[PDB]
RNA sequence: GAGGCCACGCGCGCGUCCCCCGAAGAGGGGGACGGCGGAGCGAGCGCACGGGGUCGGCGGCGACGUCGGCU
C-alpha cells in the first residue's frame, strides 16, 4: 500500500560569445552541422 | 570625417538587434550577428625551426717498405 500510494503520488502530474561559439563548433557532435556550413562557405561562391 | 588590427569573407529562408518611412508606432523597405533550416567533391605545384643525419661533397696515400689490428 505504501508503494502504491507513493506510485500514484509520483504519477500525479498537473549574443555572439565568440569563445563559446567556437567551443560549440569544436564539439564532435554538437558542431557537426555548424562546421559543415562553413565548409560549403569556403567552396561555393554565389552572387547577390 | 581627406591610420592600426581581425584564425572576418557564397547565396536563399529563418530567427535576435539596430535604421527608415511608420498612410493604427500596422506594412514593407535596409544594415549587423547567428551556435538555426533536407539533401555528397576542390586539385596542382612548391618552401619548410615540422613523428631522432645526411651530402645527388671532397682530398691524400699505398708492396720487400709501409697500412690496420683499443685485445
The share of residues in helices is 55-70%
Would you list the SSEs in sequence order as H and E? HHH
Major β-sheet, in short?
Answer: none
Structural class: mainly alpha
Shape: rod-shaped
Kindly report how far apart the N and C termini lie: 71 Å
Number of strands: 0
The number of helical runs is 3
Strand content: under 5%
Rg result: 24 Å
Summarize this, please?
By secondary structure, the chain is mostly helical. 62% of the residues lie in helices and 0% in strands.
Q: How would you describe this protein?
A:
By secondary structure, the chain is mostly helical. It has helices at 2-10, 18-26, 32-43. The termini are far apart. It binds one RNA strand of 71 nucleotides through residues 15-17, 20-25, 30-31, 33-34, 37, 40-48.
List strands and helices in order, with pairings.
Blueprint: H1 2-10, H2 18-26, H3 32-43
The structure holds one RNA strand of 71 nucleotides.
PDB class: ribosome
Keywords: In situ, Ribosome
Entry title: In situ human 60S ribosome
